[PDB]
Design a protein around this ligand. Sequence first.
Ligand SMILES: Nc1ncnc2c1ncn2[C@@H]1O[C@H](COP(=O)(O)OP(=O)(O)O)[C@@H](O)[C@H]1O
Ligand SMILES: Nc1ncnc2c1ncn2[C@@H]1O[C@H](COP(=O)(O)OP(=O)(O)O)[C@@H](O)[C@H]1O
Ligand SMILES: Nc1ncnc2c1ncn2[C@@H]1O[C@H](COP(=O)(O)OP(=O)(O)O)[C@@H](O)[C@H]1O
Ligand SMILES: Nc1ncnc2c1ncn2[C@@H]1O[C@H](COP(=O)(O)OP(=O)(O)O)[C@@H](O)[C@H]1O
Lengths: 410, 407, 386, 391
Amino acid sequence: VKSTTKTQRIASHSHVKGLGLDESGLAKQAASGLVGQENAREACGVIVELIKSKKMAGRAVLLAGPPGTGKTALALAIAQELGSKVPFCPMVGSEVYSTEIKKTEVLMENFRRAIGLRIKETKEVYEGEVTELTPCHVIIGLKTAKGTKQLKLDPSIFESLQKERVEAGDVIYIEANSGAVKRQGRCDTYATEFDLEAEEYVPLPKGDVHKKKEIIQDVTLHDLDVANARTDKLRGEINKVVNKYIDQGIAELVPGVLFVDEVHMLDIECFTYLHRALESSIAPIVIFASNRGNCVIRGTEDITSPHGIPLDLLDRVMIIRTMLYTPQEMKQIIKIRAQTEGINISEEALNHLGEIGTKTTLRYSVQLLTPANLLAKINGKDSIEKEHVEEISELFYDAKSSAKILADQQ
Amino acid sequence: VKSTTKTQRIASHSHVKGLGLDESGLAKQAASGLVGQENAREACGVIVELIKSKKMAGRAVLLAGPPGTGKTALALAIAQELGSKVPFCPMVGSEVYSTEIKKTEVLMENFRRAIGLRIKETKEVYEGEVTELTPCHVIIGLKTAKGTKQLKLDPSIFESLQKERVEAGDVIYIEANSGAVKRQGRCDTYATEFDLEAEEYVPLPKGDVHKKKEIIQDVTLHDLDVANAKLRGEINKVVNKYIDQGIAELVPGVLFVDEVHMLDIECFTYLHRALESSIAPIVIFASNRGNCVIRGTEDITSPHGIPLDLLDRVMIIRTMLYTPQEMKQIIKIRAQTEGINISEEALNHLGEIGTKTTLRYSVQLLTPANLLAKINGKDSIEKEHVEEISELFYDAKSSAKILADQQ
Amino acid sequence: IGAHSHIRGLGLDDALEPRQASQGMVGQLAARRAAGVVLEMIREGKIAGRAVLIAGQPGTGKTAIAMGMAQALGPDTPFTAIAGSEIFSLEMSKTEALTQAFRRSIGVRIKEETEIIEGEVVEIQIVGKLTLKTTEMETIYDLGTKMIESLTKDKVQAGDVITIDKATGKISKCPDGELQKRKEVVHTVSLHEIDVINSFLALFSEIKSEVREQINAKVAEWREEGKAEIIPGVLFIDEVHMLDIESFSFLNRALESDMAPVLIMATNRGITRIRGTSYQSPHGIPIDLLDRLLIVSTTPYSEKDTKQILRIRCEEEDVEMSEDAYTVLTRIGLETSLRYAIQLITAASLVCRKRKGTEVQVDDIKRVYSLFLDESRSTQYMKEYQ
Amino acid sequence: IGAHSHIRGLGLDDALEPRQASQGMVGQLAARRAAGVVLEMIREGKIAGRAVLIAGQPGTGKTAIAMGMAQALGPDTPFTAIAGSEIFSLEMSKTEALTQAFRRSIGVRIKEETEIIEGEVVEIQIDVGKLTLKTTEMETIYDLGTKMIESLTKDKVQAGDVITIDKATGKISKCPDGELQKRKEVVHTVSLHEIDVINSRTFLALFSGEIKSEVREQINAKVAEWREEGKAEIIPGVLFIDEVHMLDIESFSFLNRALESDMAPVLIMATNRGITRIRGTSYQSPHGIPIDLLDRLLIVSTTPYSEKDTKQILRIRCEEEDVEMSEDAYTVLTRIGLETSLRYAIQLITAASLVCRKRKGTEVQVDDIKRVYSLFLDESRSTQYMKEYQD
Ligand SMILES: Nc1ncnc2c1ncn2[C@@H]1O[C@H](COP(=O)(O)OP(=O)(O)O)[C@@H](O)[C@H]1O
Ligand SMILES: Nc1ncnc2c1ncn2[C@@H]1O[C@H](COP(=O)(O)OP(=O)(O)O)[C@@H](O)[C@H]1O
Ligand SMILES: Nc1ncnc2c1ncn2[C@@H]1O[C@H](COP(=O)(O)OP(=O)(O)O)[C@@H](O)[C@H]1O
Ligand SMILES: Nc1ncnc2c1ncn2[C@@H]1O[C@H](COP(=O)(O)OP(=O)(O)O)[C@@H](O)[C@H]1O
């Protein structure tokens, strides 16, 4: 079915591809698009190992740190480290307070988004090593064990292949029955020292170009929810079918990571639901994140407990701190984000952006990039200079600065 | 349909017959039963001109002033100035959220009572100058341009005429199809210095006694709603049909909302949306507080409780306080309207009483004072009677002070 | 209705360089530059999943900048200005109020063939005829007495674009082509307009959901066919601090859709407790929404810009003012709100007409100032009483 | 398809004095006068709770009499001619079929509002512009168009060209000489069924049904609204059910229900069977009708046809078919219409015409008649010989 994921939520940290740790366990300065704080990264690796050892029975992770210190980045890194396709469901605690739907529905939906389903369906794929892409259309040669097998990939599937950024000398399979193209990687013939076997330089396929390959379909329970909806009855129906598929041996359940930011905004009832659900075996992780200390648990406006979580759940939570970062790490972070977004920026501009992030936050500094490059585009330049960053800083403000500006007069 | 109007509420301002300002724009000291409050009077005149110019585009008026300074009186004067039969519906916000009913329905009915209908219908009435009043089948002579007509009436119609205090030389019309006598006035033949043309000394009717008079009935939507007892909507459709036919001319009234500071923010939004429409009547507020907290917010404090949204569309008219002279004048006017003879020293004591507490208290003191004077066999009220009445009944402030003082 | 109907764009020239006085906007160069950046970001389509909140004290043109941006996006781009308190209404729940506010901003430009009775007037023929010339031919196209009166109302005889059996419009004397310009007028009808159409004292004496579903289906069908053109507009929510946490969550949800219009909010509090919950936050907005917010701050006004604004407004209200009157009004608008200053103008006009004058003097301005109290004076005077 | 397309009233008049030819109808004077009696009964309204049954052998004019009655009642009175077996359909039940038949027989003369802006065109003004229009009241040059002025130019200009709402232009006389922008009560007899079809959502529907009850309810409420207003004047039409004996006992009770309403149209039935089995029961009744309905039945017997009458009727039909034939060919056709059914004679007419054109003639001769007589047979002959093969 369709990938029903709020890409905008995780769109800010698509450069992170994993936790980036050594075999020993330590974390390097920068790896897999993760720079800066390392102790929390080692703790996240420990949590991943605990998951793989099946020791995370009814426990959770709570990431305590100031805003803009990589909490969501660390959760995404954990999700990546458990697998490339492992579901990740980032959420805020204030979104349960809906005006039409119940907090039960919102919490159930966010739980369902966080459980993956590996359905393997044997389908005839066009696995081959792309040789040429002559649109005469578009006839493409597919080198395989038999050899180059030229087939006309229709302009539509050719544009989908371009959406896969597929070039010559690349071993991929093109779903013919579904009319889709997906990048497996390049060919091992060009594997350099950084390119190894059975990786983003995959070897030449050994077999017929059209091979029935079990397509591992990564779909979440809520991804299957939208289809039938096009209701409680619908909920149960999919559950039984998925269960049966699991028993048969074609569907493998993969619990994901459910990240809840601003945990202090959940009521006592929501915490009870979270505890009840995470008590179950299938339940994914619940990675909390708190921007404050001791707060009064909402609903009971007399009792204050650490991080706003009730004691029954706090005693069953593993706490990981995060560091506030420094200008050099923040500048490296901005460099990575700019490379991901495709913006050329001067070093002095990077230093100014880093100091701005230290003043207000990393979120603001990251968000300032697009407007600055875009102002430079207006000016007719491709590179961002210091004056552009200064102008954008004096044009748009951050929440605290604006509030003070008003208070200065108020 | 019986007129559904809170006669008691407006009964205290029956002396008010208009705004009492000249054509130039400035207001005279005393006219049309209105004394003082010159600034607010001119403001009300300006608002009247704006309403008649249809330039009140989604706007309202807020009357700010201390208790007992004629805010309700000024609203009634505005309503009178827009027309004698223009609807006027006063209401204090504290009764929107009654234990039963629904705030929406209460505000709905309040709005309805403020929208009138000028139903002009041509009915052959017996408009003629009563020459003689023989009650036998009551052949009453009605002399007109055609001449005296011994139109045989019924004892019920004669009783109705007696209820209208119709005498000889009284130019009255007796709607023939309904047998209702309504005293238009006397004849212009007996007009004197005060008696004039086209009033309680109306001139001789020109034409046949049985003339199709274009009689206008003043009735608001709410009266029809109560008469027909959804149902409410159906009454609207019939009214629209009536207006479309060409005999119902809509006339928006004035909705006076006192104690506005104690109204829900939802009610404020509803009032805003209602006044957005073009057919909407003028919504006039009144308040006594300052920057009191909005009702349903608990943290935003805005002038007079009004939320900033509505209050950005509001024309504030300030009302001043009355000095002893004005208080005494107003008390004497109210006494005259009630038929009360009062001495000047009594009026002075009443004025100083009003200065301490309120004009309401001084006005209310009149009736018990007159009854006490009547008991002692005196036709007038002396200073002793007012002293005794003040010593008998108290005012909220003084009694509260007494209770707290002992505490 | 009315209000600030004098701005038809941001007036920031090109390359985000506000040219001071232009299409209304006569100040706030920083805010204008930011609004232009936001507009061209919207054009290039990288504002998805974002919003704009304009902070500033009352009377600094927060709504004016939003209206200018809406005009700059397109000549017929929908603009919907509501207030935070506007949602807690007796008839509709906050859900319905915000849904209506959103659908008010989603405009549909649907073509509609019409036989505009147009022609370059060569002679103003008086009920009767009216010579009209086009590239198609020239003939004495007949009009009514009121149609010719409106033709004289417009500049004579430039034009005129007389829509079929309807009013005219001044162009030049030169609309040409066919005497029957069978032009499919692209009517911009907002989703809410269609919804109300499918569904005169109704306000004195809310739509189920089936009508909504039918409206959505039909609009989608037309847009897909190529007849309609869904063009998201701009939704302005003044007094955003009045909104509570539950409505903020619905706003967050609605910003996720593909049809979501550009969301602009205005606030003037800072560090105010969220209406829902008991947690203080800037401008009373939950941080989940504040993180992805483009903040624009409107600076307070100076004397010369205030006087220019007043000049424009009097030009709009057909009132001539004495220069001393203009200076006194400017000083008033600096000591009090601009809104009160604008209110003063209409009352001064009637005060002038009372004495049968042609231009308002300072005396009328002072008389009306004494007549109608403003926000600050009324409170001060009331509390002192208490 | 195009049968009975010449029966314009009963053509008797003269205080119930049927003329031999009148307007198309020739012969069957007996039943014609009886129909005239019924016609006055409809006008006087003393037919409520009663029905008419025309008995007679096939092809004697029973359907033609019904067509004349509707025309005689009014130029636009609705007429519904259905067959008894038409109710046995798999799509609709007997209830739905009969309900639909009654609906289309119930006509409503909705006096549609038409703002007729007509007027003798003094000058054809091009075009979206106006057009010089003049009437007896005043000359008010009025609004026009291009596709419309194209129609006006395509029409006779100038010949009045009465314009109704900017759709029609009557080029009769210079007659649009009233008020330039006047008003008209356009007579429109929309059958109750016709209103139903408009509301019904659904060009191949006949190939790839049944009106919903709620749809029926709404238009019934609507019809009352216009009727009270004064726009719609319900006109009771004539419903003709051929082959009435085909209907079964259950349907007959339904007819009783529908005939006891103020909207019930005059029911005319036709059958050529004597005492037969009542469908749906095990009894024998005259005409295959239950006694309850038969008691209150105005039964008129159509006499068989005479020689000269058949010849005259043929003469009328050929004029509709634009066929010129010899007198001998006429007589042979009349003889055919005597030994066999009149319908068979009409069928031969058109077929013989193409015979004449085959030899490139103008007037059909006796030779052609025999050529088509041998080609296409009559139901009696086909059945006669064809059973002969069986034994
Ligand atoms: N360790 C990290 N590595 C790379 N990018 C990071 C890291 N931490 C934060 N970011 C950047 O910060 C932004 C996300 O903010 P984050 O701090 O993860 O959320 P939170 O404020 O909840 O901790 C992203 O744009 C991301 O690029
Ligand atoms: N300007 C005025 N002119 C004449 N009478 C007035 C005036 N103002 C008040 N009064 C009288 O004093 C009264 C009390 O006023 P009140 O009802 O307290 O006004 P509000 O409460 O609306 O300020 C009324 O009964 C009215 O007759
Ligand atoms: N840039 C501008 N150019 C011209 N008039 C303006 C401008 N900004 C505001 N105004 C006008 O000034 C008055 C007060 O500003 P307004 O937009 O109401 O303030 P705010 O929205 O900040 O409360 C309004 O009449 C508005 O139209
Ligand atoms: N009075 C008449 N005048 C002219 N033609 C008639 C007359 N009566 C019958 N016909 C002819 O006879 C046919 C009548 O159809 P008919 O067989 O009576 O219908 P049914 O199916 O009810 O028997 C028509 O084709 C018509 O041309």
